[PDB]
Amino acid sequence: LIPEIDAFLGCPTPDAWIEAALADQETLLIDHKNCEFKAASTALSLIAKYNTHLDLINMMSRLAREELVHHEQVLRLMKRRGVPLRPVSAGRYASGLRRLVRAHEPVKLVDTLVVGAFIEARSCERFAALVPHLDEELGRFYHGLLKSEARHYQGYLKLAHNYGDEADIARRVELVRAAEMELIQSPDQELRFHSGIPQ
């Protein structure tokens, strides 16, 4: 039935992360831009690996296009606000979750899709947490992205059920949820969209 976002997630975005993000919105926007790109890149990696899974490929191709639209939309917002194209390395979050995916098919694919649902669900929750503190234009933008993330979280989890058993997805969601909460609540060195709490 797909749980609601806060139910699905193991913890709220911490206040300390919101404070850090509001104080460095330039790094936030750039890593946000990179996350949209990486979502599209990840979608295409799934097409490449599961290259005769027609349901997956059709969903992923369309998902990749929507994320590239978001990618371009952040670049245009950066241009409007004079944010420079500054290199920002990937954070620990997605690769930390990917470590949990099992090595053998078909549960390898199932685990990968569950991780995708968590990343989208956290993005939705975190956009929601930021909106009331942002200027009008950026809050409206992030509130607009909030609805697409909810759809993407639902899609990943639904695609997981198209390829895995209910009981096997249940255990996997429980395992990722615990690790995801740890990544969000533990201290992190720097500000990323999906980073932990700063020191």
Query: 188: which strand partners?
Result: 198
| Binding flag, residue 23, Cl ion (CB under 5 A) | yes
| Residue 19 binds: one of Ca ion, a copy of itself, Cl ion, none (C-beta under 5 to 8 A by kind) | Cl ion
Name which position in 49, 62, 65, 133 contacts Cl ion (CB under 5 A).
Answer: 65
| Binding flag, residue 70, Fe ion (CB under 5 A) | yes
CB 172 within 8 A of CB 112: no
The closest of 119, 112, 138 to 192, measured between CA atoms, is 119
10 Å Cβ neighbour count for 141? 19
CB of 10 to Ca ion, least distance (A): 6
The closest of 57, 58, 47, 59 to 120, measured between CA atoms, is 59
| Binding flag, residue 58, a copy of itself (CB under 8 A) | yes
Contact track, Fe ion, 23-52, x by CB under 5 A: -------------x----------------
Name which position in 67, 111, 180, 188 contacts Fe ion (CB under 5 A).
Answer: 67
CB 46 within 8 A of CB 56: yes
Nearest residue (CB) to Ca ion, 9 versus 29: 9
Nearest residue (CB) to Cl ion, 19 versus 55: 19
The b/e string for 105-133 (b: 16+ C-beta within 10 A; e otherwise) is eebebbbbbbbbbbbbbbbbbbbbbbbee
Give every CB contact of residue 26 below 8 A, 6+ residues apart in sequence: 83, 84, 86
Choose the binding region for Cl ion from 18-26, 92-100, 105-113, 120-128 (rule: CB under 5 A): 18-26
The residue ranges that bind a copy of itself (CB under 8 A) are 34, 37, 40-41, 44, 47-48, 51-52, 54, 57-58, 61-62, 64-65, 68-69, 71-72, 75, 85-87
Q: Which residues are annotated as a binding site?
A: 6, 9, 19, 36, 67, 70, 120, 149, 152
